[PDB]
Design a protein around this ligand. Structure first.
Ligand code: T1J
Ligand code: T1J
Lengths: 39, 156
């Protein structure tokens, strides 16, 4: 039996850590909700 | 149970100790998470029970207590923030510029940030603090990196 616990408010933080790239990918989504890369 | 708006951990005691299997968003009295986290099963908040209300395996989304309420969308240009809630760790905002998943049915924003599986359901926010989707359904690319779609539901 799964249970939930509060972890925080949902707010934009000024001067948060900034990271991650921005890839543009061709993908497919199947009936089971899984994404796959199309090449 | 707790009904306050915010981000919550989804936990289970069925494995070793207490294990975080995902995360979700409480907004307007509705709990929102990804389908793969709960498989549509009921949840507990203290002594209160949250029953599933709407779900879809292909979208990989589920709402509890009422219909899906999150309707904000990525503008396609601006940086967003992932409000990551990793297992055993404090909630932390990470700012990033999304990439794009291109599909036969249209394009979707995507965030290239790597966190453990139990972080699935963490919200992605715009500059107004609006939830534009949930993190945790995506792909692994050539270099071994994980890229999540920005998965958003439809407010009927
Ligand atoms: O949570 C996930 C996050 C990422 C990938 C897959 C899953 C599903 N795994 C899962 N094991 C559970 C055991 C007890 C209750 C809920 C559970 N969900
Ligand atoms: O990130 C992963 C992705 C896929 C599989 C396993 C891991 C574990 N590694 C890990 N990187 C973190 C970065 C921030 C907070 C917690 C973290 N845990």
């Amino acid at each position: 039996d799964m249970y939930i616990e509060r972890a925080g408010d949902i707010t934009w933080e000024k001067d948060a850590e900034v990271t991650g790239n921005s890839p543009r990918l061709d993908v497919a989504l199947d009936e089971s909700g899984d994404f796959s890369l199309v090449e | 149970g707790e009904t306050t708006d915010g981000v919550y951990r989804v936990m289970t005691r069925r494995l070793l100790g207490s294990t975080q299997v995902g995360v979700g968003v409480m907004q307007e009295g509705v709990f929102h998470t990804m389908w793969h986290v709960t498989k549509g099963a009921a949840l507990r908040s203290g002594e209160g029970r949250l029953d599933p209300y709407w779900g879809d395996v292909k979208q990989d989304l589920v709402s509890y207590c009422g219909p899906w309420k999150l309707d904000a969308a990525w503008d396609g240009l601006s940086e967003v923030q992932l409000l990551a809630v990793p297992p055993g760790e404090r909630a932390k905002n990470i700012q990033t510029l999304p990439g794009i998943f291109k599909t036969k049915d249209g394009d979707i924003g995507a965030v290239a940030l790597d966190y453990p599986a139990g972080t699935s359901g963490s919200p992605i926010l715009d500059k107004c603090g609006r939830v534009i989707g949930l993190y945790g359904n995506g792909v692994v690319i050539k270099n071994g990196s994980y890229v999540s779609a920005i998965t958003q539901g439809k407010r009927e």
